[PDB]
Design a protein around this ligand. Sequence first.
Ligand SMILES: CCOc1cc(CSc2nc3ccc4ncsc4c3[nH]2)ncc1C
Ligand SMILES: [Mg+2]
Ligand SMILES: [Zn+2]
Length: 313
Amino acid sequence: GLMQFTLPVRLCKEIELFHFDIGPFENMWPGIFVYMVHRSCGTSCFELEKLCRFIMSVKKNYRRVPYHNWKHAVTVAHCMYAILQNNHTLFTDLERKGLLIACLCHDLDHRGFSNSYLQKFDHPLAALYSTSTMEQHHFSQTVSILQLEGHNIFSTLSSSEYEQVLEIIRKAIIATDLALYFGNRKQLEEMYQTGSLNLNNQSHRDRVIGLMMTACDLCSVTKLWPVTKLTANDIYAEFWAEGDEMKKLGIQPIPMMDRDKKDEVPQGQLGFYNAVAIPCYTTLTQILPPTEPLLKACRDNLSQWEKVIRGEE
Ligand SMILES: CCOc1cc(CSc2nc3ccc4ncsc4c3[nH]2)ncc1C
Ligand SMILES: [Mg+2]
Ligand SMILES: [Zn+2]
């Protein structure tokens, strides 16, 4: 109970910033997550014995893929930690508990292939879950790990609080399905502008949590340029493999996944920042003003990609 996790000074300071990189030392990542749980939630939220055993089962169930791996899980959890820390009073105890676990679990057992590829392959998961295929899988896997003997970090919640936390984690994970983001943000955009946005309305909270999940999930674009640039290599490493596998099914992949169209990456990144990233962090900044550093970081990276196209780098 009196056992705090501590970090070295540089990490202790930088971990509070939205653009923190968790570093290349894998064996530090559990401690960083537990540190974040303790400061965001309390040293009491979870029995440490059970949280540590949960963290290591979650880690085990992430695969060795270029991007959708254990590093991504902790990265996305850190972005959520920074949102929650900069919005102290706006979220319940249950929400702070649920959302960090949701982010850690959001890509459990990812194979490095999109919902599209599972459907064209005719993967069994595409028959079990017609829409948001991987995201329903990710939640399924979260439930399974929670039900391993000694792994139920929520044991000390009431029956109703336990159903509420599982429901927060379920919506949060399904929201990471980018196909659902566009509608969710348009709806939030209308509600903020016409002035009908109400954070005591559960259906509104759900939409706002959904947008946070998208923002944490895309947070690669909100780092300093060298981190953003180096992460894109891993993102494209998965996309191009999927592209290869499309060609194996006798289907021309979209240019984003065709390694023969590497040259169009800078221009494809512009459309992605303009169509997805900037609108995401803009609506989040309007709803949660303290998350503005993410919009600024995103606009900085948009500008760095504009410079790449102009041959300046
Ligand atoms: C959820 C997807 O997240 C991403 C996705 C991407 C890739 S976006 C992207 N869109 C396109 C469109 C055409 C194209 N032609 C060659 S590369 C390329 C693209 N890359 N970068 C960063 C992040 C965080
Ligand atoms: Mg995902
Ligand atoms: Zn993700």
